[PDB]
Amino acid sequence: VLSEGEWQLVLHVWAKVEADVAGHGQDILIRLFKSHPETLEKFDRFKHLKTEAEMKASEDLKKHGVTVLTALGAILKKKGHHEAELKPLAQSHATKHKIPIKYLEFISEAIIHVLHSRHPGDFGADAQGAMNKALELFRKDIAAKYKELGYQG
Ligand code: HEM
Numbered sequence: 001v002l003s004e005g006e007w008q009l010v011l012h013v014w015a016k017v018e019a020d021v022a023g024h025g026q027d028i029l030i031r032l033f034k035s036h037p038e039t040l041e042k043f044d045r046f047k048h049l050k051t052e053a054e055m056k057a058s059e060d061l062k063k064h065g066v067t068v069l070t071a072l073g074a075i076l077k078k079k080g081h082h083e084a085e086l087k088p089l090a091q092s093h094a095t096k097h098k099i100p101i102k103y104l105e106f107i108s109e110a111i112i113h114v115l116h117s118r119h120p121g122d123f124g125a126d127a128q129g130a131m132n133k134a135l136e137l138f139r140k141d142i143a144a145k146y147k148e149l150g151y152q153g
Contacts, residue, residue: 001137002079002137006134007134009126010076010131010134012127013115013122013127014073014077016119017073017115021066021070022066024065024069025065025069026062026065027118028065028114029061030061031113031114035106035109042103045060046064071085072138075138080137082138083141086138086145090149091149093146095149095151098151100153101139101143108132108138111135
């Protein structure tokens with residue numbers, strides 16, 4: 001599992017995320033869309049946006065970046081005991097939204113990238129390794145639920 005020392009690394013940087021959830025949410029979703037354009041097409045609500053400036057100006061996008069981060073934070077602060085939190089999420093993502101597990105890998109990379117951009121002094125190698133573990137645990141447990149439902153990635 002993650003050790004208590006790894007969790008403390010993750011939650012320290014996350015409490016910095018929380019100082020500016022909306023800005024972090026925007027940078028993370030813009031990175032995802034720009035790096036992996038296919039992901040934008042999953043969003044009926046956002047697929048009209050074509051340029052980075054248009055993405056930055058959308059209030060709605062910033063609102064959904066808050067939704068995402070707020071759910072992610074709730075999961076993180078359970079420290080691996082996130083069975084309840086994860087169940088609704090993997091259900092809508094598998095069945096309603098149809099999000100492949102690979103795209104969850106992509107958003108994981110975009111979170112890590114942004115956290116390094118914004119918080120270098122608290123996001124050294126040790127905190128990066130810890131965060132990457134925590135995101136892998138999130139993926140692995142969601143992947144298990146997808147398997148059960150018959151969408152595995
Ligand atoms: C940290 C990773 C993610 C978290 C915590 C997350 C969380 C959420 C939450 C809580 C909602 C709203 C409730 C829902 O229907 O379950 C949501 C909706 C949605 N998510 Fe995710 N999601 C994540 C990754 C993704 C990815 C990678 C995509 C697409 C490539 C995606 C696509 C959607 C879509 C399409 C909606 C519906 C948006 C709308 O029509 O309102 N999510 N997200």
